[PDB]
């Protein structure tokens, strides 16, 4: 029943696409266009609000609670009668802000006839059914706009955020009680070419900021912050945003990425950690010709101290001398597998060797592997683990996992390593950070070919996810020196940020099994850094150059899986009692969502049983799937032609009768057979079999939780 009255007035402001407070670059300004944006005013519309620096072209951020009234007052000052169309429920057609053929009374258009210079108060409210009061965040944002012309009521700056939070733990302004900050985000594409002033200026301006000139979000530590995931684009455009280092908690779930469309009503909150300079990686492959970068400036203001314990609470440590050895070698790896099965003649007899006199056999494709000792020449085996190929192998993290990535480059370009959303030490980098301070807190990831560097950091209990989600979260890692070119060169893998199921030094995955992933990255040779090892240097036909032709272009545009461009060597034929965790990923040069249809097969996610799923780039999607089926079918997609006609899968799933291990070949055992000695599922130990952990000979301290109490 609270009165949340606001005074918004739209006007045309010649706002530059770059924050230039100094009049030195105004004579040669590369941006000088008008923008009709929303601007808040005082009662009776006297003086203009100063507005935050983050809200360049964004209007006033409206805030409200449940069961309250919102007598918002608007005064248009542009040129055409605009309106305000929120996302409430109590507002009627007389005050809805939508001008269309309603087939009702003509007097219902009084909310849209707001002439430029006429005041009009909208009598709106909200019902009680707009409050979650559960596992959702205490706020439910909304987007209000003008229903006149969406092509103009957005590119000019006619966008504003509306907040309908929960009455109780919220203050006056949109900030919670236990949280001391309110971070509002906005990522838009102001297409100036399609608006009111038809001027050729197709530029990707995030809130009117180009080349990463967006004002940096800054907040000191020892406090709590709250986010607001908002930002509508011109239409079907998305934004692959990510919060490096600092992990948020969207929908009370510890996540670090969010990529939807049309500004989805979602807010989040988290708790800051140590001081530093983190990154807001706005890595949008389809939106990079203009510029969109941001970072995090975490200082240190000593105000309150939490009970955050560093190590686990007197039961879990597992201090082991296990450092992951990674050497950026240039072993001979090609798009086609070693001796292909389905005969990939398009790459075997054209680019794999000296056939057709194109590239050759000796390549420089660098792959991130994992050795077993300090040799930097052979891993667990001489080749690879087959099940991953050029993709990264199996890496698991736990408390004191000693993630000491002994990286020693030896190719022709300085590389590094960076796991997705991991907090490190002020001494070692392992993250594309610009934090260059003193020698004590310096961090440089530049590892020249020949020099070795170890990124030492102790992953502990403050680096684990929640409890309701899956065990090990999928976080694909990639090089931090380069952004888009190293991914095409085969420098990408996957990391398992698991929960608190640390049993021994390796962490026994309780109620789990093996892992089956699925990657589909479409890249090009021109995107990779080793473009010189194709047609110019590593070449044997200087008279005929395979360029400027569609034949050589599509020969590089390929979708790979486990380092195998045609088809993989393994099948998805599981059996019963397979509590595995399926992972999916599909990075590349795209930005929207990617889907895949499953015929005759389904999965389990969200306490239900869906058929198909939809993954997201940047981050990694994980789901615990139990593969129980008898027969064989296809897993094709429904798109155009280069991604729907050859993206099938041939496998046979059979379980006769339990896990099918009495007359076939599979790495499982029901057992259900003659057991006269020792077989599978025979956990008979002399001291004690199992229970929860192995802190002592019997574990005498009784406090096994799943995080900070």
């Amino acid at each position: 029943a609270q009165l949340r009255q606001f005074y918004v007035a739209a006007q045309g402001i010649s706002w530059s696409y770059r924050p230039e407070p100094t009049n030195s670059s105004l004579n040669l300004s590369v941006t000088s266009f008008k923008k009709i944006v929303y601007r808040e005013y005082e009662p009776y519309f006297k003086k203009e609000k100063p507005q935050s620096t983050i809200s360049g072209l964004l209007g006033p951020t409206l805030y409200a609670e449940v069961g309250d009234i919102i007598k918002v007052h608007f005064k248009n000052k542009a040129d055409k009668p605009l309106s305000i169309h929120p996302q409430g429920i109590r507002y009627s057609k007389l005050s809805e802000g939508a001008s269309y053929l309603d087939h009702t009374f003509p007097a219902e258009k009084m909310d849209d006839a707001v002439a430029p210079g006429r005041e009009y108060t909208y009598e709106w409210s909200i019902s009680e059914d707009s409050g979650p009061t559960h596992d959702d965040p205490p706020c439910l944002t909304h987007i209000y706009y003008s229903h006149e012309n969406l092509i103009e009521d957005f590119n000019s700056g006619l966008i504003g955020p509306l907040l309908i939070c929960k009455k109780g733990t919220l203050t006056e302004g949109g900030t919670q009680k236990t949280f001391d900050k309110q971070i509002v985000l906005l990522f838009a594409v102001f297409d100036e070419s399609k608006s009111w002033s038809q001027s050729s200026s197709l530029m990707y301006t995030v809130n009117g900021y180009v080349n990463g000139t967006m004002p940096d979000i800054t907040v000191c530590a020892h406090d709590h912050i709250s986010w607001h995931l908002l930002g509508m684009s011109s239409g079907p455009e998305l934004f692959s945003i990510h919060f490096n280092g600092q992990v948020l908690e969207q929908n009370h779930h510890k996540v670090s990425a969010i990529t939807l469309v049309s500004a989805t009503s979602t807010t989040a909150n988290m708790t800051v950690g140590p001081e530093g300079k983190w990154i807001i990686s706005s890595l949008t492959p389809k939106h990079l010709q203009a510029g969109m970068q941001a970072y995090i400036d975490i200082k240190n203001c000593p105000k309150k101290t939490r009970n955050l314990k560093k190590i686990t609470r007197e039961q879990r440590r597992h201090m082991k001398r296990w450092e992951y050895f990674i050497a950026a070698e240039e072993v001979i790896w090609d798009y086609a597998p070693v001796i292909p099965a389905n005969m990939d003649k398009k790459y075997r007899s054209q680019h794999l060797d000296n056939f057709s006199n194109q590239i050759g056999k000796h390549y420089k494709k660098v792959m991130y592997t994992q050795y077993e000792d300090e040799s930097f020449t052979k891993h667990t085996v001489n080749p690879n683990m087959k099940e991953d190929g050029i993709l990264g192998p199996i890496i698991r993290a736990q408390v004191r996992d000693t993630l000491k990535i002994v990286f020693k480059n030896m190719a022709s370009r300085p590389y590094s390593i960076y796991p997705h959303g991991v907090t490190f030490s002020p001494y070692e980098d392992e993250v594309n950070s610009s934090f260059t301070s003193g020698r004590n807190n310096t961090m440089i990831r530049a590892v020249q070919p020949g020099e070795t560097y170890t990124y030492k950091w102790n992953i502990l209990e403050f680096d684990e996810p929640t409890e309701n989600d899956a065990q090990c979260l999928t976080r694909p890692y990639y090089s931090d020196v380069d952004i888009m070119r190293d991914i095409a060169s085969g420098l990408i893998g996957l990391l398992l940020i698991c929960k608190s199921r640390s049993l021994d030094r390796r962490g026994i995955q309780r109620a789990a099994d093996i892992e089956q992933q699925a990657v589909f990255a479409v890249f090009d040779e021109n995107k990779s850094w080793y473009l010189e090892d194709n047609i110019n240097k590593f070449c044997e036909n200087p008279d005929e150059v395979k360029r400027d032709d569609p034949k050589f272009y599509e020969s590089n545009i390929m979708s790979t899986i486990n380092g195998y461009v045609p088809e993989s060597i393994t099948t998805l034929g599981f059996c019963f009692d397979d509590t595995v965790q399926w992972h999916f990923c599909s990075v590349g040069t795209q930005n929207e969502i990617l889907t895949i249809h499953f015929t005759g097969h389904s999965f389990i996610y969200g306490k239900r049983h869906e058929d198909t799923l939809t993954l997201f780039p940047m981050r990694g999607e994980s789901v615990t799937v139990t593969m129980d089926n008898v027969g064989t079918w296809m897993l094709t997609s429904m798109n155009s032609s280069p991604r729907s006609k050859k993206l099938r899968l041939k496998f046979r799933d059979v379980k006769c009768i339990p896990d099918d291990d009495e007359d076939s070949y599979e790495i499982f055992e029901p057992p259900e057979s003659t057991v006269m000695a020792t077989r599978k599922m025979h956990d008979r130990l002399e001291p004690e079999d199992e229970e929860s952990d192995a802190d002592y000979d019997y574990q005498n301290r009784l406090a096994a939780a799943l995080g900070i109490r």
Binding site: H85, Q87, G88, I89, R90, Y91, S92, K93, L94, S95, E96, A98, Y100, L101, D102, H103, F105, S127, D129, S130, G131, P132, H134, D135, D136, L140, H142, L150, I151, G235, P236, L260, V261, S262, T264, S265, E592, I593, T595, H597, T599, H601, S602, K607, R608, H609, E610, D611, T612, L613, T614, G631, W633, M634, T636, S637, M638, S641, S644, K650
Partner: protein, 641 residues
């Protein structure tokens, strides 16, 4: 299931379903050479399934199969054209015996025989129903699937060869032909259809085929919504309905929309802990969730896009009144069935004289003699020359000594253009080829309708009664905007503190009158308000508390069990939050309106008023009169937000 090659029209907005503009000439051809499905109750032809009122969402798509646990319906198919057709389902882990996809198999002519159907030859084929589609967790109970051809993954979804597989749970079933309903679920398939990308491509286009149709970019690939364009019918619900909406998208893989309702918050079931508000869509899955309406009116249904709204979907859904059970033409004297049309009558009794319980042995409906009545065509065109919405019609016979005389069965029809008689009302949701009727004579019988039927040329037709065809069908309609609801001026919700009387008549050596019962159908002493004086000075003020939108009015009158008096004219005084006893302004000019009271003795007065009466203290001052002052004042307001 069938698949006869019938040319379907994508640009269906020229039919003027809910469109406004008239200068919408089609540059190319309206219809497109495609194939439509059909449902058969038998294995052979010459027997189709009549598309009922509930079977609305289909357009170019054929029927929708409803098979659940312990219930299987055959799907015999026979090719009619010259190309072999296919049929492939999705969802469960069905084997190749009921799959029908063109790939590797095992059986010779059984796993892939359904993909190659020879013309003029039937084939034995039947699908299997599972329990996987049942939504787990306490919340939902339905989750639809999809099925299409399989001879080509792309040339079939554009050839009109689509179909959704709506599968619910088991436990809640209805008596509608043993089909589980007990709700009002909807299903919509949004997917564009292309003529140049299909098997029935006639090598050329209907206008030009140089740079993908020189007239319009992909003119053959129109964004047909639900098989049509600018249509979307059946969106006529009531206030506060938690109906389930099934959103299915299989072909549109590069078209992401976000559904946002104008003033309707969302509520997710299952977990019972989420509110959301908005809910987009992803390609592949079959999203389904409730709606939960709030305020009535023509609320626009859009997806907040620029390419699929003004050129795709733009149909506002209407919410009509729920408690619109007011008298229409029985208790009033203005609205009557004077515009009735028919052909064959039933006897010699009076036509209009068909009131419930009337004096005389002649009270029915007839003009010409009946002679012989059977399964001929005694149609009774009940035309109203306006929009209609009927949810229930009563039926009562006649007697005068002992005989029953009641109609046992009668079929109903309807029409919307007079030139064609769409005799299909008898096959609605529950009905298939029959309809209820009267049972006796002294017991009133009603026939309630389930689907919100809308038309203009209503047609009823009797059959045979108890050796005397006599029918007395009443009239019960409803509102169109959905807000004109009785505030209680005649029921009892509006107390006497709001509607007050003037003077109280009291005799010296006797009793005293109580003229404060100004309601409809009152007993006791008087029946309404009768002041002591008899001039143009008395008043009858009403307190509306808040502002309202009054459109319909009614007025009968009272008496004193001797003489009947009424009022012939009055004036309505409108005001605002404060107090202002000023008559209602005339919108057609600038003066005040001169309202008319009761015309005859007991015949009510029904009139519509487009301009709202935004006021709170409405005053009624009777100008002229008849004998004495008497009127049963009762209006119909709205809830202006």
């Amino acid at each position: 299931i069938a698949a006869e090659e019938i040319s379907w029209d994508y640009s269906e907005f020229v039919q003027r379903e809910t469109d406004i503009e008239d200068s919408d000439d089609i540059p190319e051809d309206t219809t497109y050479k495609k194939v439509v499905f059909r449902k058969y109750l038998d294995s052979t032809f010459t027997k189709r399934d009549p598309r009922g009122e509930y079977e609305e969402h289909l357009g170019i798509l054929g029927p929708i199969i409803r098979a659940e646990v312990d219930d299987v319906i055959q799907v015999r198919f026979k090719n009619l054209a010259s190309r072999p057709y296919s049929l492939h389902a999705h969802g469960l882990s069905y084997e190749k015996s009921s799959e029908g996809k063109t790939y590797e198999d095992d059986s010779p002519e059984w796993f892939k025989e359904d993909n190659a159907v020879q013309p003029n030859s039937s084939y034995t084929y039947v699908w299997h129903a599972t329990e996987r589609s049942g939504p787990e967790s306490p919340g939902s109970a339905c989750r639809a699937w999809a099925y299409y051809s399989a001879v080509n993954p792309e040339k079939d979804i554009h050839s009109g060869l689509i179909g959704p597989l709506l599968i619910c749970q088991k436990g809640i079933l209805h008596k509608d032909s043993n089909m589980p309903m007990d709700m009002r679920e909807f299903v919509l398939l949004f997917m564009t259809f292309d003529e140049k990308k299909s098997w029935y491509y006639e090598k050329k286009s209907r206008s030009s085929w140089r740079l993908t149709s020189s007239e319009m970019k992909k003119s053959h690939e129109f964004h047909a919504i639900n098989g049509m364009i600018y249509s979307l019918p059946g969106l006529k619900m009531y206030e506060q309905e938690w109906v389930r909406l099934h959103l299915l998208n299989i072909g549109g893989s590069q078209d992401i929309h976000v559904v946002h309702f104008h003033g309707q918050t969302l509520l997710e079931n299952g977990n019972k802990q989420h509110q959301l508000g908005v809910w987009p869509l992803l390609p592949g899955s079959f999203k389904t969730l409730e709606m939960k309406a709030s305020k009535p009116g023509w609320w626009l249904l859009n997806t907040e896009v620029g390419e699929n709204q003004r050129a795709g979907m733009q149909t506002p859904f209407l919410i009509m009144d729920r408690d619109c059970r007011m008298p229409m033409g029985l208790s009033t004297g203005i609205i009557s069935d004077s515009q009735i049309k028919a052909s064959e009558f039933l006897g010699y009794w009076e036509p209009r004289l068909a009131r419930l319980n009337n004096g005389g042995s002649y009270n029915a409906w007839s003009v010409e003699k009946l002679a012989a009545e059977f399964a001929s065509k005694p149609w009774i065109q009940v035309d109203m020359q306006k929009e209609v919405i009927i949810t229930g019609i009563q039926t009562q016979g006649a007697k005068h000594y002992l005989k029953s005389c009641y109609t046992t069965e009668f079929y109903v029809a309807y029409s919307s253009n007079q030139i064609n008689w769409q005799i299909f009302k008898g096959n609605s949701t529950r009905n298939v080829m029959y309809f209820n009727g009267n049972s006796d004579a002294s017991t009133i019988k009603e026939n309630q309708f389930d689907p919100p039927i809308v038309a203009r040329y209503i047609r009823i037709s009797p059959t045979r009664a108890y050796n005397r065809p006599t029918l007395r069908l009443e009239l019960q309609g409803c509102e169109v905007n959905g807000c004109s609801t009785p505030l209680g001026m005649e029921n009892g919700k509006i107390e006497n503190k709001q509607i007050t009387a003037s003077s109280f008549k009291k005799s010296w050596w006797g009793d005293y009158w109580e003229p404060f019962r100004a309601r409809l159908n009152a007993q006791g002493r008087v029946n309404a308000w009768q002041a002591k004086a008899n001039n143009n000075k008395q008043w009858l003020e009403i307190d509306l508390l808040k502002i309202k939108k009054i459109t319909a009015i009614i007025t009968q009158g009272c008496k004193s069990l001797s003489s009947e008096m009424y009022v012939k004219s009055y004036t309505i005084h409108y005001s605002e939050q404060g107090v202002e006893w000023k008559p209602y302004r005339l919108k057609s000019s600038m003066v005040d309106k001169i309202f008319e009271g009761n015309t005859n003795t007991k015949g009510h007065v029904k009139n519509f008023f487009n301009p709202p009466i935004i006021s709170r203290f409405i005053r009624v001052i009777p100008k002229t009169w008849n004998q004495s002052i008497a009127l049963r004042l009762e209006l119909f307001g709205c809830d202006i937000y």
